[PDB]
Amino acid sequence: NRAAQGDITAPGGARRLTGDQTAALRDSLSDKPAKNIILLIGDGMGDSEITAARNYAEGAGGFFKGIDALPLTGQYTHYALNKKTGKPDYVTASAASATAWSTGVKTYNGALGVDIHEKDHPTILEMAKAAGLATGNVSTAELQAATPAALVAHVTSSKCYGPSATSEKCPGNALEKGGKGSITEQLLNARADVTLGGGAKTFAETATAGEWQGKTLREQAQARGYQLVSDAASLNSVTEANQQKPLLGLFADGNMPVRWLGPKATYHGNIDKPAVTCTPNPQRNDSVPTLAQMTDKAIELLSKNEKGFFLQVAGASIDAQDHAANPCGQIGETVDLDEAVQRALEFAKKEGNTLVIVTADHAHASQIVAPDTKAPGLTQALNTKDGAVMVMSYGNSEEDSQEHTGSQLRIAAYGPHAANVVGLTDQTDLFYTMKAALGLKWSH
Amino acid sequence: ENRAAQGDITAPGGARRLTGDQTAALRDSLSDKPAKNIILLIGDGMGDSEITAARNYAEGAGGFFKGIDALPLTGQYTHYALNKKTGKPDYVTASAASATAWSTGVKTYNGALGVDIHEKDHPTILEMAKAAGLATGNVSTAELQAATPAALVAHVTSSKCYGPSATSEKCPGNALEKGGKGSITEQLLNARADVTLGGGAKTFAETATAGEWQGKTLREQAQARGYQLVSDAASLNSVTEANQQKPLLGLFADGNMPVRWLGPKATYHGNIDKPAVTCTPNPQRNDSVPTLAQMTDKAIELLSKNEKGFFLQVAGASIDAQDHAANPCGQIGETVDLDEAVQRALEFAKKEGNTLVIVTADHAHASQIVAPDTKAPGLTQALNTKDGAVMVMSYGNSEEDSQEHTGSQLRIAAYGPHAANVVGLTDQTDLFYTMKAALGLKWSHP
Ligand SMILES: [Zn+2]
Ligand SMILES: [Zn+2]
Ligand SMILES: [Zn+2]
Ligand SMILES: [Zn+2]
Ligand SMILES: [Zn+2]
Ligand SMILES: [Zn+2]
Ligand SMILES: [Zn+2]
């Protein structure tokens, strides 16, 4: 536990440490191999997003029982490359960054599972599947979006969701042109044991060529022996997920609804509008499973594999709400991810050979600023758990979308080989850290 | 020891900063043994964004700070202050409340220096190290009366109480002539650190209204209390002792010492409407003005002579000043200036073996690294980095002439004995207790 000791106004009352950490940190360090890996990604969850969400939901002296409970921490760099020059591009897109940790190769903004030469590389999910391990891919967003897709697809443009967009924007990857296919076609080919998220609308599209030509991708999946679940009741009813009966969960047309509702940040919002208190999103049906609910069922099904498993969990709507300059939606998705991190650690502590990693693909726009601030961008005053006002600001874009930032950010880990996230590392080091931990070998 | 990119950042594994497994090396970095010395280096407003922007510019994205990034044990720490009336958190701290938190282990309100929300003074880590017979050093690139060096030697209810003039008016409770301990400078001279180096010479021109050295300038008071006064690099070098008999006071500027790099101020649509900038040495900085590393190196040399040990604090204060000024070049230049000082500290620590070196910031700041094409509402600028690529920096949290601090948790890094105590999530106040325990210091207030 790293919460404040007691009276934050008294000497020592704000301390998060109870004593010396040397002995406990020594015991946290293991050279032994990981049987399983649980990688949790908060999309755009920079140190600012963690602090804003803790300050709001848990109080400044508060503590995330998930996100902040990982003992070994560091900062890692996530710059992408300029496709023409091969030089760094200091602000990565979600796809170039997801490619970096899933393949250990940097790439250009737009690329998914391919380097700057458009050459595809095997992913940590593919290599784990090759070694006989169970594979899980869970996201709160569309399964075709950057984070879940980087594990199962190789396309020259991250916009190549289905056959329609692929033929037009990735002619080289289009199935009817000799290519591996759209992100969804490649996802179905990849055959992860557990795939849960949104992006049901692309499964409505039909294949232009191949073995399941003229049938919807939804129909292709059914014909290929997949289990299709669309709500929390049916997801719960699943008892097995393997290579014979793989599980595909489609819980939204696009992105699954955000858990918290609040207004969008506005120009002088902290001055001109009242302090906001986040409310549960009423449009969200209770039948839509949460990230922790999906994480928990994935963990359950994947741990039946005696050789081990690799699971990736993506709190993708953190980024979406940061883009939308919506502090409530953004904080809500950080809280949603914290619940999933808690499930992962609960499991890891009990199992003993599970490496849990919690990080982000890049930093984002949101900043915590003084309540009195007169900023040129979009702002909002929020009423936190402390009973004090916090002002959040979005001042890096005049367009309707707030943008990613290139700041290095927190990488945290628990379990075997977790020492490899401490100090300064690169997003690509994460790939090799995972590969080594599971004792995987290059395969495609 | 090195965390630069392996080779070809475009090739698989070429961008890796790791050469192998880090478990064994991190096990060896962990020491339960006590620290003979501590070197605390503070980059004022040096959030993770400031570290990245500087590295990207000066060393390349796959680059590495031989100082700042060479500390093996790392974590994130929280630096919120308190609202004086409610005692509730104030999510964005000023420099003085944050400096008070790590130097006393007590949170305080924005304005306070060395005092809690009740205006009650608490002993500082410098005071306790001095009480146990250790040598004490306080080095900064800005005014010695400013937040970071001041939090170690003064207790005032307003950080603006530099000299007797401002104190009588804004801190009547602390004013010497009203029974108080005095202005920041009066308290600094009383604190008698063995080594004090920085700016803020103009306040030493003021005379005391009351006390033992009434009617004499604070500069004359220092001389009368056996201090050594140095004002340039040549004189700093000429110093040989620095103890309680002959303490050293270095005043290298009237106010803040000039920044090392010159670049234009960020402007509205600067990345679009103005050419990419390349930072140039500041022509207003004389070579006679000592650098942070030069001051750090002489302080380490003089304090080392103490057989019982020493406590040294080093403040790269102008990082904040240039972030406030939305000047990417000045800001990056001062992060580079601090990296040189961190290098001196580690060079020393690695050789000595019992020195705990800590590198952190008092709070985060405004600057953000954004896409080159960005159309931002605030102030922006395009910069030509070591990579031969353009980096755009943005300042979008203030319409006023000063960019503001941010409340994001930030990096804390450490090397040496008890360095494990910065790993994971901690509080700025945990740093005080980490340093107290490492040196085996006991609560004392002379
Ligand atoms: Zn992203
Ligand atoms: Zn593949
Ligand atoms: Zn995004
Ligand atoms: Zn500051
Ligand atoms: Zn005192
Ligand atoms: Zn020297
Ligand atoms: Zn400041």
UniProtKB/Swiss-Prot annotation, chain B:
Protein residues bound to Zn(2+) 1: 320, 324, 405
Cofactor remark: Binds 1 Mg(2+) ion.
Superkingdom of source: Bacteria
EC number: 3.1.3.1
Protein name: Alkaline phosphatase
Stretches assigned to coiled coil: none
Chain sites annotated for binding Zn(2+) 2: 44, 362-363
Protein family (similarity comment): Belongs to the alkaline phosphatase family.
GO terms, biological process: protein dephosphorylation
SUPFAM superfamilies for the chain: Alkaline phosphatase-like (SSF53649)
GO CC term, one of those recorded: periplasmic space
A GO molecular function held by the record: alkaline phosphatase activity
Record's catalysed reaction(s): a phosphate monoester + H2O = an alcohol + phosphate
Keywords: Disulfide bond, Hydrolase, Magnesium, Metal-binding, Periplasm, Phosphoprotein, Signal, Zinc
Binding site for Mg(2+): 44, 146, 148, 315
